[PDB]
């Protein structure tokens, strides 16, 4: 709905340096970010933690959306889990909550991670787009020591029109992402 | 159908007389099986509840 | 001994052996071969005695191809019991050969060294047999 600092960043700076490399013969063939699916993917909320909520409202006040409880695919023995047990926290940041979130990761949250050292670049899938994992949560700007209780890393997935892995590299690299080498 | 699964008849709470015939697990729903149903001696739907068969 | 290493069913029915084989009536691996002239079941006992026979013929050398596998349960009632009270327990394992089916092939072996070889292995068998060499009819097949 809105207009923000990375949304225009992707606008007049990124679209050209992309037609730079691959020289797209059409307005749309050019990459662009669609979905952003954050995944705390608990399982720490087994047959116990009803307090999975005070860890997922934190997920709300850092993503802006309520996260939807993903349950069990089936029942699992050594994992201590029954088909139906809550074990996931999926929030799909789509459209203009994506840019509002993605910039706040890159400019403020990404650097505040302890001993930052690039981004693992092989972790690109190939057939399409990209995603890679965390370690914590309070590194995110919205919180600190007393507000955050238990520690909880989280997964984060990009879904772009990057048909090819190479052109994905460029899209994110230019968009503000620091890589390992 | 067993110890656990008791049988039960549906009372009509307008006149207290019996009406229907079915079963119910007395474990997971130890309550009273209360369901709207029909009456020939009333020709109108009403309230019904488990009287011990 | 050539037993099925896993089994779908325990005992299995008899079934008559009408007619010629269903496949493998043309050599396909070795140079020469042994074939059925008459239908039988062949025991793993028999099969292994033919193999061991040839193997001992060209002691040290040669390669043996054997194109039938004991997949049928040869059941049998224990000693001195009357009829009924179930089916026999499975006593052996046999393979169904019909006339034409190829059983033993050899390669890396002289002419008569595979004649005498596939001769004796014929003798450890309950049936009349013919030895035939690979031919174009087999290549065209």
């Amino acid at each position: 709905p809105l207009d923000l600092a990375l949304k225009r960043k992707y606008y007049e700076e990124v679209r050209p340096e992309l037609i730079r490399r691959f020289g797209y013969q059409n307005v749309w063939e050019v990459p662009r970010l669609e979905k952003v699916v954050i995944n705390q993917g608990l399982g720490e909320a087994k047959e116990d933690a009803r307090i999975l909520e005070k860890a997922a409202q934190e997920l709300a006040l850092i993503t802006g959306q309520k996260p939807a409880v993903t349950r069990a695919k089936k029942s699992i023995s050594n994992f201590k889990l029954r088909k139906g047990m809550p074990i996931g926290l999926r929030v799909t940041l789509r459209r203009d909550r994506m840019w509002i979130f993605l910039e706040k990761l890159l400019n403020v949250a990404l650097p505040r991670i302890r001993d930052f050292r690039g981004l693992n670049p092989n972790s690109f899938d190939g057939r399409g787009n990209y995603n890679l994992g965390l370690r914590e949560q309070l590194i995110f700007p919205e919180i600190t020591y007393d507000m955050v209780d238990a520690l909880r890393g989280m997964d984060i997935a990009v879904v772009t029109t990057a048909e090819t892995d190479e052109e994905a590299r460029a899209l994110l690299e230019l968009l503000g992402f620091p890589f390992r080498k | 159908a067993s110890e656990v699964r008791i049988k039960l008849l549906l009372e009509c709470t307008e006149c207290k007389r019996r009406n229907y015939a079915t079963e119910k697990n007395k474990r997971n729903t130890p309550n009273k099986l209360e369901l709207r149903k029909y009456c020939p001696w009333c020709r109108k739907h009403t309230v019904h509840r488990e009287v011990k068969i | 001994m050539l037993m099925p290493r896993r089994m779908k069913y325990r005992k299995q029915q008899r079934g008559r052996l009408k007619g010629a084989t269903k496949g493998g009536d043309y050599v396909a691996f070795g140079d020469f071969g042994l074939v059925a002239l008459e239908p039988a079941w062949i025991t793993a006992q028999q099969i292994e005695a033919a193999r061991v026979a040839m193997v001992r013929h060209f002691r040290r050398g040669g390669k043996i191809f054997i194109r039938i596998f004991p997949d049928k349960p040869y059941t049998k009632k224990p000693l001195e019991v009357r009829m009924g009270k179930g089916k026999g327990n499975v006593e052996g394992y046999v393979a169904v050969v019909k006339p034409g089916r190829v059983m033993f092939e050899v390669a890396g072996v002289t002419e008569e060294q595979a004649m005498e070889a596939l001769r004796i292995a014929g003798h450890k068998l309950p049936i009349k047999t013919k030895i035939v060499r690979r031919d174009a009819y087999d290549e065209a097949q």
Partner: protein, 84 residues
């Protein structure tokens, strides 16, 4: 002189006959109500004027001949085509 430790079969059990299958045939006059096919799961599909019972029975809804149709990947059907 005879029997010894005679093995008892664990089986020898069996089901009833279900007398299933097709009961009326194409180009066979039927009236409304008739059963055209008994089965366990639509090997045959409920055509025009052909209904299906709580066990997948297939019964005629109106009179006049039954008629079989085979729509390949879609399914085998039977309909009744009314009188004249």
């Amino acid at each position: 002189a005879h029997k010894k430790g005679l093995g008892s079969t664990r089986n020898g059990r069996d089901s009833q006959a279900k007398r299933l299958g097709v009961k009326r045939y194409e180009g066979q006059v039927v009236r409304a109500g008739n059963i055209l096919v008994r089965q366990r799961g639509t090997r045959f599909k409920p055509g025009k004027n052909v209904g299906m019972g709580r066990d997948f029975t297939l019964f005629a809804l109106v009179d006049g001949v039954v008629e079989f149709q085979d729509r390949g990947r879609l399914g085998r059907y039977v309909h009744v085509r009314p009188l004249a």
